[PDB]
């Protein structure tokens, strides 16, 4: 794994990408790591925001599946041509696999100017692949064609340069401290988990736990924010407001439309509360909690000022534990054991007084009832 450490790069707020190669001879591309979808896709035609792109005609091993595909996301969408080719990860396992590849030929609000990635690696399950579950996702193909164990882990390191590690096939202990706590994957489609309690600076939000998972809760490396179901978002904002008493912020700030700025070096983190999500544990009536700091949910936007955007936002399609959550943690996607592990990240941003945390056990009854049905 030492050869996989620090294999992720990016621009703050623009996405974490791994270098991959496709075709013959190898065409090097930067690919966004996305646990929130299941399609492997690459820019395959010129676009204002692409420095490079997949040239199918230059790959001797490219196969045209002669079928189109369309993939819509919460933010953006693209359409393209299905096909297959040979795929390797330079700073990952030493192997070449054949995999499905969507060559993106049309897109809207998908590519991000200056982000330095040209494609996306959907790491979730076949069930949500487009056009349908018969289009084998990359990680399934990797596992089937090699001896790479059915597991990967992500360490996303926040901030304007960003970095981290995608450890393919294992867990690198130098990337975390303390204990790993596991939560079951409720269902193999997205990486769906179950949130059983929410606290803001130790104050219970006091909602029925089903609200926290309406209509699902997912772990998504390809989404910036912590996105909460509308009802939960409103309650969270009210509680966060109350907690941050010494300062009043405009409505626009809480909607992510206005930045808050302070003299460089004087950000009063102490004003804002920590936020804890309790997750269903692997043992009956047992939960654990992960706690994030405002250094996670107030994201720096790029003079002599530090400006931040509030990065907790509303969702119409359930909770999304995005980069805001993941940057505090080393996260183990244990597909073999149908579970997601969390530990305190060795690289998370914090201060001399508070730290991101993973702690348990806590007693929580009837946790299974916290799941929403359908």
């Amino acid at each position: 794994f030492v050869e996989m450490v620090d294999n992720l790069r990016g621009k703050s707020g623009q996405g974490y990408y791994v270098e991959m190669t496709v075709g013959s001879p190898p065409q090097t591309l930067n690919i966004l790591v996305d646990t929130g979808s299941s399609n492997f896709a690459v820019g395959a035609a010129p676009h204002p925001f692409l420095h490079r792109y997949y040239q199918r005609q230059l790959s001797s091993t490219y196969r045209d599946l002669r079928k189109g595909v369309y993939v819509p996301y919460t933010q953006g969408a693209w359409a393209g041509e299905l096909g297959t080719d040979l795929v390797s990860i330079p700073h990952g396992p030493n192997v070449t696999v054949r995999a499905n590849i969507a060559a993106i030929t049309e897109s809207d609000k998908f590519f991000i100017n200056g982000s330095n990635w040209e494609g996306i690696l959907g790491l979730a399950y076949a069930e949500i692949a487009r056009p349908d579950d018969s289009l084998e996702p990359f990680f399934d193909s990797l596992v089937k064609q090699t001896h790479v164990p059915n597991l990967f882990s992500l360490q996303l390191c926040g901030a304007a340069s960003v970095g981290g590690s995608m450890i393919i096939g294992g867990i690198d202990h130098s990337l975390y401290t303390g204990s790993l706590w596991y939560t079951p994957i409720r269902r193999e489609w997205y990486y769906e988990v179950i949130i059983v309690r929410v606290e803001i600076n130790g104050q219970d939000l006091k909602m029925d736990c089903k609200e926290y998972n309406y209509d699902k809760s997912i772990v998504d490396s390809g989404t910036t924010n912590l996105r909460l179901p509308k009802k939960v978002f409103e309650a969270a904002v009210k509680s966060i407001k109350a907690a941050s008493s010494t300062e009043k912020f405009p409505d626009g700030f809480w909607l992510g439309e206005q930045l808050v700025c302070w003299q460089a070096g004087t950000t009063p983190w102490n004003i804002f509360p920590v936020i804890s999500l309790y997750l269903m544990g692997e043992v009956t009536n047992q939960s654990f909690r992960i706690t994030i700091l405002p250094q996670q949910y107030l994201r720096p936007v790029e003079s002599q000022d530090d400006c931040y955007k509030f990065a907790i936002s509303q969702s119409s399609t359930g909770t999304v534990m995005g980069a805001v959550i993941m940057e505090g943690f080393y996260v183990v996607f244990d597909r073999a054991r149908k579970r997601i592990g969390f530990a305190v990240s060795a690289c998370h941003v914090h201060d001399e007084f508070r730290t991101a945390a993973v702690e348990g056990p806590f007693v929580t009854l009837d946790m299974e009832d916290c799941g929403y049905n359908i």
Partner: peptide, 5 residues
């Protein structure tokens, strides 16, 4: 990143 399901 998927919308729909």
């Amino acid at each position: 990143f998927l919308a729909x399901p």
